[PDB]
């Protein structure tokens, strides 16, 4: 087990459903011996002899640029085209639709409160679940 | 008559406006702005080249005679390019008046020293240099005055942290007072006190 | 034993002489030193306890830190303390000396004189009233009274 | 990009004042070591002088080099007149301070700082 | 009340108590843990509920200007008492 | 007080206590709050 | 209100398995020394990674580069997204191309298999706002959720 | 780790190092350096003391508020030893005397007390036990103190099998009884040296390095159960050392030989002193027992400390033994001593 930081505890990049890139900021530091998540993999890489070419948050985001350059355009929606192409590649898929009704995982406010790990560690969300249930 | 609001006077504000025009007509090469506050205090804002001539005229002129340098100090305003506002508060015993003369400076643009005009300024200019790092030309003895020997930085600059960077303790291994990076058992707690509602409509800035 | 008893009363004898003659070093820093002058004033007359101010650290027993200790003055305070012959005691008087006080967060202040010298008695207040300092001084005599140097030498 | 000079009109006329300050600092180490009864050698003191002059080896603005020279003269004067003490002179040598490792792994083991 | 932990340390009224293996217990060796033994929660529960006629009652804590700021409590919810938000006294309507 | 006694209270100390500094009764400061961050407890069984 | 889950069940210390198979606290230098030791053996298909629902891009790219440096390409995510057709080749395939503020300009919304009220609560807020002011017509292919 | 010992901060006084050490013997020469190093990095330090409170005052300013805990103990009473080692994750033993008293002989100080501490530390559940011994500790040793140290090492490792044993050579520092001992021979005009000091080799070590490696052993994973040899980087014949010392103090050096039995008999006279002996027979023996050659034992450098030469630091010990005429003489005015590779 390698204790990593939480989103409140690091400056991290997340991309929302629109594709907009935006960044968190450190509010508190990680507890105990936890470490920022990208520096554990960088610490791990040097022990194993395949050192990765980045030693600071700046250099890691420069590397994010090299991959997908819209992950450093913060708060920016980058327009995308070429949907027509994706469709033309989708008309060839020979798979067919089953007859199952489309039932979402969350039907009622009961299933809303506890989905991910942090939601499940919360004593306030447990009350909310117990509140609507009973 | 309002028993809670400060009496306003009338004549003094008119007198200091007349003298402010007087000073601006005579030193047009140096004066950049003249104003009188509602407290009734005259301010002359000069180009820094004009410091020595401006304080010399105000000291030796017969209808001025501002012979006492009440004090000299700087204000740090980082948003300005010339972030240091130098303020001279002068006193006229002949006319029982006061006057403020202000100029500006940056980090790399020293001001002339008025020690030739007011010996009182000698230590005041040492204090500006020490606390704000504003160098003065022609100072007889420009050196720190208030900070510890070999203190690095200018602690009254707005971007200098309140607790500083180093602290002292006695180290029994080396048998002397040593300097080390600052760590506080309790951090200074910053309070956000500003109210989000405007208190003075008279000072509202245009949103341009 | 008899010798262990005699050592005890010899211990009280030497303590008593140090309790009864505390010579503080003429040395004050800021406003706390004004209240230290009031303790010397007629109403409290510390002299009546055998407390006499002596200017030279060689002739002084006690160093009362009565005011703020800045970084510029920190080495000098330590030097006059080192030059005090032993036994020697420090009374830290006031918030400034106790822990920085009103200037705890200043870049130029030592956050407590006990980072520089060992302190025996802490006297709270800003400033402590002359009686508060007097209570602290008399609390230092009781500390000396509890000294057990000779007895501990016997059991070595 | 035009600005009033302090003293020097360009970097070459400013390096002249730098070497002249380095000379003075170089002549004074053997006295500081002798008068302050420092527990170092002259060679070790003079090396420390050189180390501080090389801390500002990247400065190029002539006005900046004027104000480093101005400060260094103030520092020289505080030492020649013995306004500084052993503690003050010895602070340049950071003898009680363990130095923070400059490698990623050691920083990573030691805490959250970069 | 002043419960005692299995480790033998007294538990303060805020429920704090060093664990068994917390080293910070060493500060109490040859000394003591300062604990206040008059738990305000236990003392306030001992007071009887004052009964009043009207449906709205003002509490200032007693002593007038020596109490807390004067507030009013509704007494309609005739199943629980009205509690002062400052002093913790309880009120209930007569009928 | 023999003529103007203080108001009695059930929490007022009955027994005074003088300066207990240096003695085994001396006050010792400590944090009166409880733990804030709770750590995960691993399972006590193999997987 | 869920931030209070950040204060319970936290991993604060590296852990490894001891000889009885239980997790025990260890040190960073120790724990990384185990993972590097195993990483130096396996390569290619024998090493894979899964990214969870709360991982930063600075850690996905970092974990990508590491595994690509031992030949592996099994970088996966718990979420499923059809990789047939274009797959993730074109961003337009897996994004909200009209944006969140584009809902305010449409005049019909067709929802296919989703309860936006709970999946994207503030995106359902932006729909109702257009439903209220711009008189947006809304249709749902799926279950008759509220 | 328990949540109250995880190290935070940056290794300043207000930081937390995760070390909770009970240092037995902190009131001595090496003790103030061990506590200072522990205290400066932000370690809780428990300090058992038997002396008067006045004698532990100089340690009070070695830790931030709360980081130092002074406890009264009597080495005869076991219950007081438990009271101190009860909350520690490391226990460091520095107890020792250079002479015997009525109430404690070399066996007590160097065998029983260390075993009593180690026995209580094992029962209390202490992770590390650091025990200081001596480089020339050995059961075939002339010196009575140095044989007991050899026994004590073994007692300690019987009841604490994983104990770390530190073997320093002669420690030299401001308060040492090594360079200040020879600098004080000047009071007797001449310097009696057995065989004129040419048969004895010494490899003295600076106290701050001993203390800095002892503290580094409180956190080094690769130290449990090892024995270390802490020694200076230079070996000198006793003669050249004693000659160099007088060069550093600028006193007149007049060495003459003195047979070990006449020298041993003098040390017995000074040992009659009811106070702290100026010398003793055992101290005279130890001065002439030659330092062992370092053969297969990890040293200072394995604990991340670089030995400090006797040349860098002599003047801070010996300047107070000068007269006014030489107070200001600099380190360079003295010719360095001559080293030997055997
Ligand atoms: C040189 C001459 C020596 C003679 C003086 C020594 C006696 C000191 C005690 C004394 O005189 O005052 C009583 C002192 C006074 O006690 P005290 O000093 O605690 O009281 C001071 C506080 N007020 C003023 C409120 C009373 O008694 C003692 O506590 C000390 C007794 C020690 C006696 C020495 C041991 C016997 C000698 C062997
Ligand atoms: C006028 C004359 C006043 C003297 C009256 C008689 C009292 C004599 C008591 C000794 C004088 C005080 C000396 C002292 O404080 O040191 C204590 C010393 C210190 O005890 P120690 O040996 O345990 O201290 C060791 C050094 N330290 C603590 C720093 C590690 O004890 C003595 O040896 C005094 C012996 C007393 C015997 C009387 C004759 C002494 C000459
Ligand atoms: N040159 C050196 O200094 C060398 C030292 N060592 C070893 O290092 C350790 C310390 O060296 P050093 O510091 O010089 O020793 P010290 O002479 O400084 O005395 C060390 C400590 O031992 C304590 N002590 C002695 N006897 C007792 C006792 N009977 N009961 C309780 N405490 C006692 C003393 O406490 P109090 O002062 O209250 O008696 C003192 O604090 C010793 O083991 C020593 O042999 C090893 C090699 C060389
Ligand atoms: C035939 C005659 C031959 C000449 C005699 C043989 C030499 C024997 C004496 C050697 C020198 C004695 O000198 C003595 O040195 C010891 C050893 O540190 C010092 O011993 C003491 O000094 C101070 C006193 O508080 C302490 O800090 C120190 O820790 C303690 O050891 C004495 O202060 C000094 O007086
Ligand atoms: C002569 C012997 C005695 C017993 C005398 O009665 C008294 C007790 C000693 C005196 C007067 C001073 C004692 C210590 C000291 C040096 C104080 C600092 C000080 N001293 C001032 O003035 C004198 C000030 O003046 C504004 C100060 O601000 C300060 C800060
Ligand atoms: S504690 Fe108060 S009275 Fe004393 S020196 Fe500081 S500011 Fe002055
Ligand atoms: Zn109330």
mmCIF file with all atom_site columns, C-alpha atoms and ligand atoms in Angstrom, chain E residues 58-62 67-71 73 83-91, ligand 7:
data_model
loop_
_atom_site.group_PDB
_atom_site.id
_atom_site.type_symbol
_atom_site.label_atom_id
_atom_site.label_alt_id
_atom_site.label_comp_id
_atom_site.label_asym_id
_atom_site.label_entity_id
_atom_site.label_seq_id
_atom_site.pdbx_PDB_ins_code
_atom_site.Cartn_x
_atom_site.Cartn_y
_atom_site.Cartn_z
_atom_site.occupancy
_atom_site.B_iso_or_equiv
_atom_site.pdbx_formal_charge
_atom_site.auth_seq_id
_atom_site.auth_comp_id
_atom_site.auth_asym_id
_atom_site.auth_atom_id
_atom_site.pdbx_PDB_model_num
ATOM   1  C  CA  . UNK E 1 58 ? -37.178 35.695 27.665 1.00 0.00 ? 58 UNK E CA  1
ATOM   2  C  CA  . UNK E 1 59 ? -33.981 34.399 29.269 1.00 0.00 ? 59 UNK E CA  1
ATOM   3  C  CA  . UNK E 1 60 ? -31.035 36.629 30.119 1.00 0.00 ? 60 UNK E CA  1
ATOM   4  C  CA  . UNK E 1 61 ? -29.253 34.176 32.407 1.00 0.00 ? 61 UNK E CA  1
ATOM   5  C  CA  . UNK E 1 62 ? -29.918 36.092 35.608 1.00 0.00 ? 62 UNK E CA  1
ATOM   6  C  CA  . UNK E 1 67 ? -25.866 37.547 32.262 1.00 0.00 ? 67 UNK E CA  1
ATOM   7  C  CA  . UNK E 1 68 ? -25.967 36.875 28.542 1.00 0.00 ? 68 UNK E CA  1
ATOM   8  C  CA  . UNK E 1 69 ? -27.762 38.758 25.767 1.00 0.00 ? 69 UNK E CA  1
ATOM   9  C  CA  . UNK E 1 70 ? -31.512 38.548 26.222 1.00 0.00 ? 70 UNK E CA  1
ATOM   10 C  CA  . UNK E 1 71 ? -33.260 36.085 23.892 1.00 0.00 ? 71 UNK E CA  1
ATOM   11 C  CA  . UNK E 1 73 ? -37.726 30.921 23.296 1.00 0.00 ? 73 UNK E CA  1
ATOM   12 C  CA  . UNK E 1 83 ? -33.604 25.522 25.749 1.00 0.00 ? 83 UNK E CA  1
ATOM   13 C  CA  . UNK E 1 84 ? -31.659 28.741 26.117 1.00 0.00 ? 84 UNK E CA  1
ATOM   14 C  CA  . UNK E 1 85 ? -28.945 28.898 23.502 1.00 0.00 ? 85 UNK E CA  1
ATOM   15 C  CA  . UNK E 1 86 ? -26.613 30.721 25.899 1.00 0.00 ? 86 UNK E CA  1
ATOM   16 C  CA  . UNK E 1 87 ? -27.024 29.349 29.433 1.00 0.00 ? 87 UNK E CA  1
ATOM   17 C  CA  . UNK E 1 88 ? -28.706 26.026 28.698 1.00 0.00 ? 88 UNK E CA  1
ATOM   18 C  CA  . UNK E 1 89 ? -31.676 26.515 31.018 1.00 0.00 ? 89 UNK E CA  1
ATOM   19 C  CA  . UNK E 1 90 ? -34.883 24.728 30.080 1.00 0.00 ? 90 UNK E CA  1
ATOM   20 C  CA  . UNK E 1 91 ? -38.418 26.070 29.932 1.00 0.00 ? 91 UNK E CA  1
HETATM 21 ZN ZN1 . LIG I 2 .  ? -30.243 31.861 29.123 1.00 0.00 ? 7  LIG I ZN1 1
#
